[PDB]
Each structure stands twice: as structure tokens, then as C-alpha cells.
């Protein structure tokens, strides 16, 4: 029954993985929490099983975590960045197979389940280079005789909470920094991804065992809402970078709050597109399909809202229904798909309460709407016209391939919509007016941590620190100082002097 | 019977102060809520009256502020910074009879008064030129025809919320700095130096005025916890700074994050300086006592824990009591006097009870430990020996001049002494040995925001961020990168290529 | 005769200024070399004298900013900065008699000579900040136990050699950076200016000798080629900062080059300025005017090339003439005028050989091109059409206020055209073209130090790092990391471990 | 008789060479030139020939280096920094045979030969995360509606000379980063290094063509003077990175400024560790020795210099003797061996003429001094006490394992004696006193590029930039900021507002 028992199947032992894997890796594998059952979006089929961790579990592994950051936190960062080095190879020699399970247990199409493991392999080579730069000024101390210097130094033990739509990739970017950064690491990755997590965890693993490294440097304990919310809770995890819901991940904000810990938020996206009535639609159009549809619309930076100017809308709709009339919808490992399936049967049911909330809202389906009758959890990628900007639907948003098409007319009322929801993560606008591209860019521009210019919303590349503002959480992650939110800061003057401070007054011996 | 009513006292009204004073700027002064009269701790007298903010004041202040911010953010940031050096001037030509008031409202001595006008000086200079720097690198984009730019923009409203212990310097950084990053700001500092805020905010919006530029870019709503609370609930406050204790910024910080706002909180210390068996006592002693007694212990930095090696523990603590015993008391104006009185009487009867407590946990007074005979909120500066490292008033503490001094053997048990507290803030040793002095240094060191090597907890200047780790709160203030806190990061990638996207086996138009 | 003693000039004594002038500061005052008479150049009177340095004037003066630089060099950078802010506020207090002795001079008119002084202002300020911040990173060794720092101290002496045409900025922008990186400087101003030089000079010499410094941290030596030859081979004179002449700045590289010193070269520029048919005219035609025009053409960043597409050529060449004709032509001082006189005698000979010489190259005089009949050196500003890009005139270009007119049609040809000249100092584009912006400032776009878009030749502010390439010399001044060339990295490991070496089979003790 | 014709030397073919070798590269191998034929210094055999550049192929691969400029600048700096991976990688594989045959071909020992391909491997993994980072600042501009820019793009041809010492790390160093920085590279090595040169091109070339780029990206010119002096001379050689003598590094430097060209200048050292009476004598031994007699006493930054203060100078100095008795001489292929020979018998005859001018100023030889009665090129390493510091030969200094020891007293005499050589290159001090270390970084410290703190004078990794000042040349190699000389800077203003410029008066229209 399971699929990884069936022939075609056998590359899944290219990765170490076998019928009843364990979840829980702290130098060494186990798991005596639920035994959970990964299936496969595409068909609903079970994949394999992975053995989650009790509390026990992640005791022993937090434990043997801070063990282990006393002997990381004293190995050169350079030397750090030689271990991440190596992860990287060893991410790039299994790179095929270990995105055609990403496509196989998550649901994305084969070029983006390979395309996230490039971007761990890409963040991994960046690091290594990072290894050698980190670090702060050396200050000129207004005192005579004195040093001033700025220190970094690991935090120490950070938890990575990652979601189910980047398996991969989210968790990398938090390794590969915290890891030259001096600290360990403790991953909980979305229960239905759970044989993405312990692929990864083993190409891993055998890294720092080969290099005799203790392998709680980068734990492991595969589990549900009950160990993040223990992660959350545990003064022992200094950072807890955390990548998923604005709902969980508010609460988890909070209780590290309470505790006066760190947190790295990566919350949800309202992400839109302005087209401009001097945009250049040949490039309008291709740019909002690929980032509406892309990964069946389950990217943070997916595009849910398409502002046009009103001379275009018309058009730009309806030349985006003839092309979304084309997506090609079939297996994600099928090398001529583009759309896939969503990842759960209960993102199909959400998707379904948002179509005909549109409706009830006053909007006007006018392509898709409907679930697919064929297994697994595929729904038509869907464009809803006639919505006002504030319609409720569209400010709270859903995680469906639902685009919200809105008219406007001038630049201030759509940076103002654009500005307007809780979340603030990515934002496109699409013009040639060199005026507005830069005010654009500024301060009464887009409120958002990624502001594009003709490239839609799910551009960025690890150069730059990814993250959003306001509901998204803060965070940021990947490139640029993201690495300080790794590290803690100190201010150290050294009085090298031999000047004694003065007396005031007092007589010292 | 009010101070400003005597002739003596006549040099306050160079500061624009009478009898009773609106406590609301926002262009306009007002105030229509509760009057406060704040009392000379020296003398237990009422200075003035201030006409604190009702929630109708704080509701038009907000909006001002924020109408306001419209005007300032178009403003470009070198020239926001001709106004901070302004602002610079403007304190320069009072910094006198300015730092005469923080000695008569607040207790400190004359010229940690002037000292603390000087900070916000310095740090006034310092933003000048931050202001044609501040921004973020040109990224080398890895796709051909963008570029890849990150932007800093302001986050609109930093609401400051200060302490009574530096009721000038602490505003004064958030002021520089939020200032010349764009943003408007809306103080409220703490009620008993409500004279300070109303003087500091005079000087400040003369330089505003002067200008022509709305008054409300720097607004004033004097009041308490009620004030406070509203600004840490209040959506339209994009960035709240809080100055004050771990109880109320734990839940300032609990507040600001349900809301998902940013915080920059700099909280409470419990301050350690450790002397090693090869430190220069000549330097030891005078450090010990000047960073113990100053401001009559009343500083966030103020060394509360005084760890010495068992070889010189004797010879060190008899060295203080010698030297305690010539501490000059006195009214904190006059100049032959090195220690006021506790800013309130409240203080005074704590100071009491922690003398009391720590016989209690086994404690000796080897120095002072009573209440000075004297008009005024004076005590002695209080030396105790004998304590546990862990015993319960050293770990939590006051707000007390009492040093705990402790015995300690060898070099990695102090330095776990020194990080076990709840608190973060500084961190001095004395010693000649340069592997100790980096080992403090690094990652199994100092964990505090300020780790200090033969110069006391006190030692920090405008150049390095400032502020502390754990129960401190993680906020930084003044120099360095600190400026970013005060901003909004985005990261901006721009297509201006005329290429198209791949058509991905789709027919576009 | 002297306009000195004239009492419509009066104001000149306000600086300070005397009939005959010592020209040696050094901290006392001097001078037994020759005695040069200055010139206004707005009616060819004498304004005053000055005594230049002999020999001897100059041995001693290197002498004693070598000793100052003992004390100079021990003075913590941020106090370095409290001078620099002084000097600021000293020259605020006689901007306007400073401006006026640099139109009465120099013959720039009011606003500019004003704007000059202003620019060492600006400098100043920035300057303040900035010495809190110089300095390099702390680096992660790749060794156990080991600190990895870069340093940066001063080089010690800093020669300044400047030019007539900016007779205070170039010198201020050199001197507050030099300052506040702890170096000494020695001044050798243009002998055309040496009023100038020694009015500056009294200004810093004051502010010194207030704060209880060597005056000689800030030396002056007025003379011509022989005494900059002598600072060009000295030895003693760590970092050469010459501003001048393409052919002398040569010569002064290859001395400082002979002997290993270091040299800061701002030699000449041949800028154009290119107009795209897509551009704002309303925008092209007054900035044309201006950057041409402008301190009648004597300007490093002048516009010398127009290059204009073909279809718009004669429309904007039509526009320019009858604006030309507009220009407000007068003695520099006063108010209202725009356009002053040459600076010397023979720079009016020169523009006539220009004239001629460009006609007989086959260039039409469209507007302008003779000597006005007024007391002064006036020459109208002058427009040649006709000549082909790559005329010789067009090359190496005089420093006559003469517009050189081209056609063009299309990118590739008119980018190469620009950088085709020995200079690489300023350019500018005019263009509405998203894509040829960023093409402008990428590669294959302009190759000078200055590279402006939708604005002239002369758009620079101290934020940024002022400088060329090719024949202009490749220095740099004022802003970004431009400080560097005024300090000397180190790059320092401390090895703060009791680790021994591997004995690599040695017995040793 | 040729090495690589006798079976035991077959691992030769490995590298691609044979009997006679193309020591042109430029997308085509070739050579016109005169044969050399260079030699093993171990045993003075024939290894085997290069055909070496003409100067018609010279002219030829500066024009194709040209021509694949304008490819390789187009592609994306992270895209660059792929193929500097990748040549990593290639590096990695050839590792071994190619430290054997810079053991072989120079003459310093294996593990050194394999540590000089590291650090080539080294250099280009930190280039492939700086190419990611690479770049300058925006900054805000003064103008409102302007942006203002830093913005870095290659120079375009670098040209790369090389000497013997170094015949692998020093091209690396600069090609990796040239290469992430958009620039072009033009080879020619030592001429008695020449094998290596085809050697390393050859790994690089196999990965270019790989990714089908142009070869000429990293051309290759074997050849002396005479090909050296072209490049100098030769406008289209954007920078010349030039490694080598003083007195020829001198020569170049002018020839570079005449042209207005760019140079980095890497240029000799005579390095001075110092040892004050509080240093750990088992590591000041140690290091003492293995920074002399490393590489035969061949390095840039080889220890010629030992200053000891005179209550520890005969004891230093006996337990140099004893160690230097048990330095292992060989065959530096042989494994063990600490020590080859030098790399030409005119060195060896260096070696001869400065032990017999040291005895004669007064020096004593304690060990060493003698020729070796064996094949090749071997010297004793020799150790020369009695000499005053300032000694003739001391401050000449030949490229000879000669280790000259004096005295000192006080830290001022022996800072000063650091100083007063004309090079600058590398320095130590081994002290445990805290200030003197700070005294020692600071302005009145070492002159040199490189100031190390009880570590010798080879002391330098990847991650800081390597060069040094006076007549070492000032250029810096490899980190830092130091890809800033393979680039250069503009500074740009974008109005992107329709703001036009003031009138003043004149009428446009």
C-alpha cells in the first residue's frame, strides 16, 4: 500500500528513507511520539511513516543540543563555513531525487521541488563566504587609552519552525546562517512534510558525523503544534525563527515575548500587483498568471491581489483568462506540468469557502471556481472580478489560487490599497514612469519588505534579507545583516591605559 | 511654597517654566487631565505643576503627529539633520540651566545633570552626519537586466516612553535618531520629572517653530502608566521605544507584539564588575566605588554585584570602606558634592527594606546600610559582604545604592555568575591577562549588551549601540547600525530589461 | 591703488586682511619668499599682498606639523571631530565676507562663492559624525584562539595643493577629513587666490589656538610650482591631495609615485552632457545653460560636450541661443548677475585661440565667441555647432566657457562617444528610458567618477565620494569611504591562546 | 634527461604537460616566443619547456581578453561568482599533483606546495559569497526627488605579474576576485615558474570552456621583462597587479602612473618579530624559527628581523641554536622535510655574499652560514647576533634565510626600529603586556600592512586584505574590502522628480 514499497517508487531509497523512518535525530535517530503517515497530494496515497517525537524526545534533544553548542561555538566561524560548505555539496550530489520528493510528499511541480534544494545549496555557498565577514567595527573610543569594539557572538541554541509549502528551502536559509553564525540548531518542520525533514536531516547528519561534529549541532524532532508550542515556551531556544500562519505564528510571538526570548517571524502575504495604464502588458500578464498560479498559489509571495488601471483592466482580464485557459494541470513530477495539487484536502474545502465567500461578497467568478473531479486536491486556479479593494474576502485572504482583480485610477489611491491590509509581505508594480518607480520605493510608497518593479511578487533571490512587515512578522532572513538576528550584540571598551579614573575628592591608597 | 514661586530658583523660568505648565505638545501646548506637582528630593519641596494629558489630548496628538509625519518624511533626511543640529544648538545654549533642573527635579548631581544635556548634544552631532549615511547597499542581482536595492524608509510614529533615572540623554537618542530616519515622535516621560520633559520639549519646538515645520514631529503627553499603556495598544504608534522596568516593559512588550508593532525595549540591570587576583587595585577600588555610588545608584548600568578572587576579597572590600567613608553628601547642585539623595521617599523606605532582606539571607553591612540624618531622600551608600552568589536580593534586586560583594575562585564559575541573572545589561572585569580579557569576549563570555574590561558598568559612549540581552529587553539605542530600528527595511528588486517572462508552453498576446 | 584700502571694500578687514599679508602659517606667522599681488578680475585692480614661503618657510613649517602630529595623533578621533565642528561654526560666523572675497578673487559670483563656503560647512558637520565612525571590522580568524581586526590610523602629513577655480571647498572637503582621521595638514592654495588661502587659514588658526592646539596641525605655505615640486618629493609629506591641471597633476604623480608616497589626484574634466529624444526639453535647455555657463565655465565638472539626438538638435540648439541671450553678465558680487569674468588675462587669450581654432576645425559659432568691450576679463559664453565628435578642440578641451554641440542617433554610439575623451570626471544623460538609466550606470554605460541622470555635469553633494577616472587621476573626496585614502590599513591576528605551535618534529625546550 | 620523460615523474602528464608546453592561452594555446626550459632547484635537472609569448601573441590576447570583456561584464556578478566556485572545485581535484609540482618546479616543501593550492581553493569559495555582496551604499540625497547612488563596475583588463615565491597564490588571490568583480585577467608568471602557470591555466581554462565562455577571461602570457614592461606600458591594461621586486615593482608603478593606468603593488618586505621580556619563550621560539627558515627563508613575509630584549636575548637565542640543529633538510617532495632549496643558484650566491658582508660589519654567525655539499641549491639557515639594528645589510636584506637578532631595551627604541626600514610589510610583537599590544595597533605603533600580536610575520589568512605600505607598495590582496581596487566607483544622482531647475530670470519656454 505505502508507495514507497512499490518499484517505481525506489528512488525514495536513494535517500535513506524506508517504510517506518524515525523523526527525532539528535546524533541519534529515534522517536517515540505518534507514528504519523505522510500521503501524497497528487493521488492521496500514503507515502511512508515517520515516528514523531515525544517529550522526552525533544528534552533528551534540546539537552543534547546545548551540549553540543559548546563544542560548535568554539570552532572558527571559517571552519563553520567549511562544514556548510560540505552540506552544500552534499545537498548538491542528491539533488534530483530530493526534489522529486518535494513534489512527491508536498505537491509543487519538479523544476520548484529542485529549484528549492538549488536555493539550499545557493545559501549554503553564500555562507561560507559569510563565515569569514561576520562581524562588527572597531569604533574610535572618544576616551584616550581605550578600545572600542562592537562583538557578535552565536545566541546559542536556535529553533527553526518551517511550513509545509517550502520544506526545504526555509529551513536552509535558518541553517546555513545560524550555522556559520556559531549556533546549533533544532528543527520541527510541518507534520505533512515530515519525509522532507528527515531526507534532509540525513544529508546532514552524515556531514557532521564525517567530520567527527556532534550531530545535535542540527537536531531534528519531527512533530505538530505541541512541540513548536514547547519550542515557543523553552528559555533553553535562544531564537526561535518561526515560518507559517499569522494566527500560529502571533501566538508563538507572544510566549517568546513572554519569556523575553527571541523570535524571527515569517508570517502570511496579501501580496499585489499594480498594473499601470503605461505598463508593458506583454509583461503584465505572464508575470501575474506564473505569480498567481505558481505552486497552485501557495507561496507567501503569492499574488492575491491584481490592481489595474481602469483604461487595461478589461483587457488585462481578459487576456489573462485566455492564458490561464492553457495552464497544463497533471502529476507535479510530470515533467510538462505547471499546476498541481493543493497539499491538503482541507485546503481544497478552504478554497471552496473562499469562492463562494467572493460570490456573497458581490464578486463575479470569471474563470475557475470549481474543485477538479480527479484524485488528489486539485482546484481550477480562479479570478474574481468586481470586488471593491476593502471587500472582507480579500483583506483576510486565503491560501488558494485565488487572484482578486481590482480597478483603480490614480497612483495614490492604489499605493494606499496596496497599503492597506495586515500583512506586508511583497508588492509589484508594473510602469515605466521613472517618478512613480522611485516614490514607489519610498516613503509613501509600498509598506511591504519586498517591493518589486516590473517583476511580480515572488522576486527575490538570497542577496537580499527576505521578510515582511507589519502582520508578516518582522523577520528577515537569508541575505544583507540578516545573520545579526542569529548573533547578539555587545559594546566592549577596553581601557588599556594605565590612567587611573579621578579621585574626586577621594583619598585611595 | 513652590520652589518657582523663590526668588533662589528664579534661573527656572530661563526654561520657559512658571507655576503651572501644560504638559501637551503638539504643535500647541495644553493638557486636560490630571495636574502633578513634582517635588526637589533634596529638600522634599514642590517645584511646578504640570497639566498632564487627558485621552482626548493623546487622541489629537496622534493625529497631529501623524498629519505631520507627511510633511517631515518628504523632507530629505541630510536636511531633517540640519534641524537635529538645530536642535544640537539649541541645548548647547541652555545645557547649564538645563542640567540645573535634572539635578532639582530628578537628585542627580550637577554635573552628571549637564553630563546627561551633553549626551544629547553629542548624540545631535553624531545623527548630523548619520543623516547623509543612512541607508543599504546596491546588490549585484544574479538575473541579467535588474537591479537589486535594498531601502530603508521611516515606520512613521516612534512613540518614546522614559524613565525618571535619565529623564533627558534616553529621550535625546531616540529623538536624534528616529528623527533624522524620517519619523515623528510622541514622548511620555516618566510623571516625576515632568518639568524635564516640558523643559526639553520647549527648546525643541522653538527649533521647530523656528523652522516652519509642524510642531507635532516632536509631540509631548505628559502622564502615567494610563498614557503608556495607550501608546503600547495603540496601532498608530509604529515603533515604541520603552525606557523603564523588566516588570512594565515585559508587559509593554507583550502589548506591542499582540498588535505585531516593533519594540525597542532597554530594561532593567543587575550589573556585575569581577576582579581577578592579577587586576590593578589602584584601579579596582575607584571603578568599584564610583560606578556603585554614582547617581546614588539610580542607573540602569549601576554596578550592583562586585565579584572579587578570594586572594584579594579582604583587602579590596577594606579599601572601600575607606573609601566610602569620604563620599561627599550632599545637594546635588553643589559642586563639592559627589552623591544626592534617592529620587523618591518610597526609595528611601525600599533602600531600607533590602538592607533589612539581605541580613535576612545572611548578609554583613560592612559600610552604611541607614538613612542619613538630613532633610532630603539621603541614604548611605551601602557596602554588604557575605551573600551566596544566588542568594535572592543579589539575582533580583533594587533600585538601591547597595553593592553585594562576592567571593569567587577561578575564572569560569564567575563568568556563570555573571550570566546567571535574569538581567543583561553590563558587565565589567578587571584583569591584565589577555586570553581572560578575550574569552570574556567571546561566545562563552560576558552575555551582556555591554561587556567592559577595566573600566566599570558605566562605561558607554554615543558611538556603540546601547543597551542589553534577557530580561534587558534586546533593544538598542544611539550608535552604530541602532538607527535601523527606527526604520523599515525593503528589499527591491527592479526589472528594467525589455525581456519577457518564458512562455512556459502558454500562447500570450 | 590696492582695493583694500578702498572703503567700499572695507568688509575685507572683517577676515582679517591687511594690505600685505603673511602667507606661512605654521603656528606663528610668516613669510620671506616673494611677495604677490592678487587681482580682481571684475575690473583688473590689485586687491592686497601676500608674502609666499621661501625655502626655509617651508623646511620649518613640515618641521613643526610633524611635531604637532605627536599630539595630534593621541587625540581620540570623536574629539578630533569636536575641532572640525568648531572650525564649522567659525566659518558660519563670515560666510557672507568669505563668500565675497571668493567673487572679489576668485570673480565667481555671490551665491556660488557663498555655496563654496557652505560646502566646507556641510563637510564639517558630516565630518563630526563621521569621527565616530571611521574605523574597520572586527574579522573571524580561521584560528582557535585568535582576534582578527583591521585598523586604520592616519597617515600622518597631508599636503593639500588646490586650485583657483574652488578656492575653499576643495581645500575644506580635504582638510575636515584629513582632520578628523588624525592627520596634519599642509596648505599650498592657488597664487591667484592667496587672499583666499590666508583668509581660511586665520579662520582655522583661531579655532586651534582657542582649544590649545599647535597651530600647525592645519600649516599653510603660499607659493606656485616650486614649493608644490617640494611637497610633490618630499618624503615627509605622507599623503599628496593635489587638485589641478591634467598635465601638472601628472608630474606631481610620478614625483610622489618615485618616492612611494601616496598620492590624491582631482585633475581636469571634459563632461558632456547627453539629451535623448524621449527627454523633458523644459528640463535639457535650462540645465544645458546652467552647467555650461555656470562660474563662466571654470568649473572641473563644466559642460563642455552637448550631445543631442538628431531629431531634437536644432529645437534644443534654438532654445539654448535665446536663453544664452538672457544671461545676466556683471561684476560677480553683484546681485542678480549670473555671469562673471575669466579669472585671468590669459585665460581670455586662451578662449580666443579656442574660438578660432574651432572654427578653422570646421565648427559654426552659433552664439558668442568674442572678448566683451568692459573692464575685467569678460568673454560671452559661447556656442560651436558642426564639429564632429571627435574633433581634436573637442578632446582636449580649454578651460574657456565654450559649449561644444554634437549630434547623435542612437545609445551604443553616443555612450562610447562620452567616454571616448582622456577624462573621466562628470556626465550626465537626460532620458525618460527605465532601461537606459540602469544601462548608463552599468558596464557598458558612463566610464567617469560622476554619472547623473536628469541632471547636469555639476550635480554632486558631500554624501557621496567626489572624484574621476582616467586622466582626472582617481581620487577621491568628501563623502562615502573617501576617508581611506587619508589612513593606512592594518590587518592584525592577536593570538591570545596559550596554544604553542606544532613543533612540527622539533624538539624544543 | 627532462623530468617528465622519466617514468617516476609520469604524475607530471596529469597536469596536461609535456615535453614541450604552449605557454599562451587566450582561448587557443600557442607560443611564438623563445623556449624556456626551467629546472628543478633540488637537483638543477631539466623538468620541462615552455614555449613563451611573442609580442605579436602578446598583442593578439590582449585583444581577444578585450573582445571576451564585453561578454563576461554582461553576466551577473553571482553568476560570475558560479564559475569561481567551480574553479574551486577544479583546484580541489588536482590538488595533489599540483602542490608536487610547485614543490617540484620552486622548490618549497609539499605540504606548503599543497597549502599555496588551498589557499587558491580558499580564496575562490570566500569570492563566491562576496559576489553576492559586492557593491556600494544608496544614499540620501539632499535633493528632494533625487536618489543618489554608489555604484561599482569592473575596470575591464586586469593584468596579473607574478614572481617565484608564490607562483600559485597570488595569481588566485587576484583572479577570483577579479573575476566576481566583471573583470578580465592576463597572466605572466615568473619565467622559472612557468610549468605552474600552464599548469593553473589549464585547470581554469577546462572550466570556462566548460561553460562555454570565452577562454581569454583568464588569458595567459608566459614570458620576462619584456612581456612585463608591455603590459605596464600598454593603455588597455585597465589595473596591473604586480608582485615582485622592489626596485622592478618601482619601475612598473611609474610606468602604470604615466598612463594614468591602476596599479596594486605588492612589493618586499623585511619583516621584524619582536621579543619583550614578559613573551612566552616556548611560543616565541617556535615561531621564530618556522617564520625564518619557512620556504627556505623565500617569503614576502619571511621573519629577517628578530629584536629581543637583553634579559632574554641569549637565552632566545640558544634555544634558536638548538632548534635550527633539528631542521630536516631534503628533497621538498620528500616526506618530513621542513626545509628545500632556494629557488636559483644566483640566490644561493646572495645567500654567500650577505653572510660574508655581515661578518664584516661586525656580525657573528651561530649557526649556519655554509653552502651544502649536495645537489641543488641548498643553503644553511643561518642565524647572524652582534649587528646594531641598523646595520647595512640588515636594512638591504636579500631573499636569503638569514636571520639577523639584535637587542633592545624600551618599546619606544625597538617600535621605532620596526619602522625605519624603507618596506612595510609584515611585523611582530610577542608580549603578554596589554597596553603595548594597543600601543602597538595604534598610530604610534608598526608601520606595517600587517601587525601581529604573538604570531610571527606569515601570520595572514583569506579574510583580512594582504599588502603593505611604504616601499612595499600599498596594494592589497584578497579580503576586506579589497575587491574595491578591481572596480571603480561612480557616484550618481537620478532625478527622477519633474521638478525643473530655478529660472533665475531667464525666460524659457
Chains 1, 2, 3, 4 share one sequence.
Not at 514523531?52 to 551540549?67: I, L, N, P
Not at 560548505?85 to 511541480?109: F, H, N, P, T, Y
Not at 515572488?458 to 512578522?473: D, L, N, R, Y
Amino acid at each position: 500500500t505505502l508507495l514507497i514499497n512499490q518499484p517505481q517508487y525506489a528512488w525514495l531509497k536513494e535517500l535513506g528513507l524506508r517504510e517506518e523512518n524515525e523523526g527525532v535525530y539528535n546524533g541519534s535517530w529515534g522517536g517515540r511520539g505518534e507514528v504519523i503517515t505522510t500521503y501524497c497530494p497528487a493521488n492521496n496515497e500514503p507515502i511512508a511513516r515517520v515516528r514523531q517525537a515525544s517529550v522526552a524526545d525533544y528534552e533528551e534533544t534540546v539537552k543534547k543540543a546545548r551540549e553540543a553548542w559548546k563544542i560548535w561555538a568554539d570552532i572558527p566561524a571559517p571552519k563553520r563555513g567549511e562544514i556548510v560548505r560540505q552540506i552544500g555539496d552534499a545537498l548538491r550530489e542528491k539533488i534530483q531525487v530530493l526534489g522529486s520528493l518535494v513534489s512527491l510528499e508536498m505537491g509543487k511541480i519538479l523544476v520548484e521541488g529542485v529549484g528549492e534544494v538549488q536555493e539550499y545549496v545557493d545559501i549554503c555557498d553564500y555562507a561560507v563566504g559569510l563565515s569569514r565577514m561576520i562581524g562588527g567595527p572597531i569604533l574610535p573610543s572618544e576616551r584616550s587609552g581605550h578600545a572600542l569594539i562592537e562583538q557578535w557572538n552565536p545566541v546559542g541554541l536556535v529553533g527553526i519552525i518551517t511550513a509545509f509549502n517550502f520544506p526545504v528551502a526555509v529551513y536552509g536559509w535558518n541553517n546555513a546562517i545560524a550555522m556559520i553564525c556559531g549556533n546549533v540548531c533544532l528543527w520541527k518542520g510541518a507534520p505533512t512534510t515530515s519525509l522532507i525533514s528527515v531526507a534532509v536531516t540525513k544529508i546532514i547528519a552524515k556531514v557532521l558525523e564525517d567530520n567527527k561534529l556532534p550531530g545535535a549541532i542540527c537536531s531534528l524532532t519531527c512533530g505538530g503544534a505541541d512541540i513548536g508550542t514547547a519550542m515557543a515556551k523553552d528559555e533553553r531556544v535562544n531564537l526561535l525563527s518561526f515560518t507559517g500562519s499569522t494566527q500560529v505564528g502571533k501566538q508563538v510571538g507572544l510566549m517568546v515575548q513572554e519569556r523575553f526570548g527571541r523570535s524571527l517571524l515569517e508570517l502570511g502575504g496579501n501580496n499585489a500587483i499594480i498594473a499601470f495604464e503605461d505598463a508593458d502588458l506583454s509583461l503584465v500578464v505572464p508575470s501575474a498568471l506564473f505569480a498567481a498560479v505558481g505552486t497552485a498559489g501557495q507561496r507567501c509571495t503569492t499574488a492575491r491581489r491584481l490592481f489595474i488601471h481602469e483604461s487595461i483592466h478589461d483587457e488585462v482580464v481578459n487576456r489573462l483568462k485566455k492564458a490561464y485557459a492553457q495552464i497544463r494541470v497533471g502529476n507535479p513530477w510530470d515533467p510538462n506540468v505547471l499546476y498541481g495539487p493543493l497539499h491538503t484536502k482541507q485546503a481544497v474545502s478552504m478554497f471552496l469557502g473562499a469562492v463562494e465567500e467572493a460570490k456573497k461578497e458581490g464578486g463575479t467568478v470569471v474563470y475557475g471556481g470549481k474543485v477538479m473531479d480527479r484524485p488528489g486536491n486539485y482546484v481550477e486556479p480562479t479570478i474574481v472580478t468586481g470586488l471593491g479593494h476593502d471587500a472582507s474576502i480579500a483583506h483576510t485572504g486565503t491560501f488558494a489560487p485565488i487572484l482578486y482583480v481590482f480597478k483603480f485610477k490614480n497612483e495614490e489611491e492604489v499605493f494606499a490599497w496596496n497599503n492597506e491590509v495586515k500583512q506586508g509581505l511583497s508588492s509589484s508594480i508594473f510602469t515605466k514612469d521613472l517618478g512613480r518607480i522611485f516614490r514607489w520605493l519610498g516613503p509613501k510608497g509600498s509598506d511591504c519588505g519586498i517591493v518589486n518593479v516590473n517583476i511580480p511578487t515572488s522576486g527575490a533571490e538570497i542577496g537580499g534579507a527576505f521578510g515582511g512587515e507589519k502582520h508578516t512578522g518582522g523577520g528577515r532572513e537569508s541575505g544583507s545583516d540578516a545573520w545579526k538576528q542569529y548573533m547578539r550584540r555587545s559594546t566592549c571598551t577596553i581601557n588599556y591605559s594605565k590612567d587611573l579614573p579621578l579621585a574626586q575628592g577621594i583619598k585611595f591608597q
